[PDB]
Swiss-Prot record, chain A:
It is found in: Cytoplasm; Secreted; Endosome; Lysosome. The chain holds residues 61 to 152 of 692 of the full protein. Residues 1-92 form a propeptide. Monomer. Can self-associate to form dimers and higher multimers which may have increased LDLR degrading activity. The precursor protein but not the mature protein may form multimers. Interacts with APOB, VLDLR, LRP8/APOER2 and BACE1. The full-length immature form (pro-PCSK9) interacts with SCNN1A, SCNN1B and SCNN1G. The pro-PCSK9 form (via C-terminal domain) interacts with LDLR. Interacts (via the C-terminal domain) with ANXA2 (via repeat Annexin 1); the interaction inhibits the degradation of LDLR. It is linked to Hypercholesterolemia, familial, 3: A form of hypercholesterolemia, a disorder of lipoprotein metabolism characterized by elevated serum low-density lipoprotein (LDL) cholesterol levels, which result in excess deposition of cholesterol in tissues and leads to xanthelasma, xanthomas, accelerated atherosclerosis and increased risk of premature coronary heart disease. FHCL3 inheritance is autosomal dominant. Cleavage by furin and PCSK5 generates a truncated inactive protein that is unable to induce LDLR degradation. The C-terminal domain (CRD) is essential for the LDLR-binding and degrading activities. The gene is PCSK9. This is Proprotein convertase subtilisin/kexin type 9.
Amino acid sequence: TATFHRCAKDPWRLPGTYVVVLKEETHLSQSERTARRLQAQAARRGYLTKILHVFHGLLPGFLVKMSGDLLELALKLPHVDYIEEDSSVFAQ
Amino acid sequence: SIPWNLERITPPRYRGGSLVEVYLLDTSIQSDHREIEGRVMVTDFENVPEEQASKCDSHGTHLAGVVSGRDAGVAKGASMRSLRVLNCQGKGTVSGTLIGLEFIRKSQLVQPVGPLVVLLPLAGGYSRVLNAACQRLARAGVVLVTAAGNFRDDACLYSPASAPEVITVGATNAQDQPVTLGTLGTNFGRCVDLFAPGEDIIGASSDCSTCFVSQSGTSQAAAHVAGIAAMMLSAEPELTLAELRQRLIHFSAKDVINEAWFPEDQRVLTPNLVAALPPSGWQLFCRTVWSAHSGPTRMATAVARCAPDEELLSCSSFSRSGKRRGERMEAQGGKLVCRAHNAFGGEGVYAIARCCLLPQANCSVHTAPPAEASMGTRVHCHQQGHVLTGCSSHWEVEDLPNQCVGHREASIHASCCHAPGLECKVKEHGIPAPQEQVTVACEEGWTLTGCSALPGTSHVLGAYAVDNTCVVRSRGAVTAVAICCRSRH
């Protein structure tokens, strides 16, 4: 069952954008259909979404701009391992 | 005229990394600066959040100079490629960094080259996805070097610093002490692998094509190790991550940092190592691996694992309170690990692994249960040709030559290896009234494989190897026992 994570440093959180990470085996084709399925399910519920990027190479999944309202729904999508809210990094 | 930091990483005996490429994920850079012109390629990958060329280019230009700069670089004339994931105020996102790492991996697949070092001079809070991405990219055979972070805090709370399969670098100054930065300073803790020069580091300034500026930070420090690693990989292209990390540790200057600067609990967890180039036969490399603290749960166990190509040669445990049930060596996936048990009413324990590169090695564990109503629990490597490299012990209660001895109520575990090329000896030092700790050290040219306290009724907090010294911590007498081995050719 998939879990949700966001930065423990509150000022460093960037809500409204989420990294959806799929299970290791997940193939690029499946990643893309999962993202399309989210947009569609999101649309039926009145929510605009934007798929900003689909990951292939290290980590299967995608980057989606959406309301956090949609996280329960997104966590029930097929192949989902976990979802992480984007956050800031800084030059050291 | 030689900058202090370039002299500092020069070994006691000394005479670029051209078949290695270094990737830099930072701000944009002034690529035509004379320190780096012609040797750094801008990929023009950009992914940065919304917010002067010189100001924007400042951080990345300096770092490119530190790694490979013509006059002030570590690996002068090594090749670099730069990606932009930080904006003009030096800020980026995890997703942006994720996409950049993905970009590096795709490029490698499309056009394979040699060893790749990835420098990540950036930090955010602990991130599961960023750590997984670094782990993945490392398991694909890339070397990642990252900044410990500048928050004067435990680096395990930040990423990518806390990612176990990356090399995380803290910053020290010309006095070999941890760098202060305003009210903060270098991070520390068991997620930091070593330190390197990170104060008053001169390098390319994006103010003008020939200008130079001095900067401070764990980014600068990480840049030194990235360049050192480039040199190590150029000389020994076949090194695995574990072999490279053991060399970085081995060729580092030891115990020059004054640990008092760190908060109390973090002093044992923090490697006292300042990086250095190798001076340039087979010998025995070991390193000490601390687990995450187990936690207070009743059946809590902390686990310390070696890399796949290392052997676990011994296993100890430590608790600040001293409420502990010891440690055992056990197999998982067919690899032995070090597993420590918390006392039911305790706050938690650390497991502490001693992990070594021993290829011609067939090792195993021998265990005896409590003897009870005997002198003590004993076990030993019975066959000829096998050497004992470590003793461990764990018990179930709350109250209480080639051979290990334990308390009569405890189980006893010996690590035994068949390794003919290897010679080992045991050195002991006992202190009647332990002031706070008793230590004993292997002779120069020998490697500590095992560290433990001689059994009794001492209220010992635990034991651990610090480089080649065995440290036993106490709250009759207390005796430290070190097992030391060296190659013979």
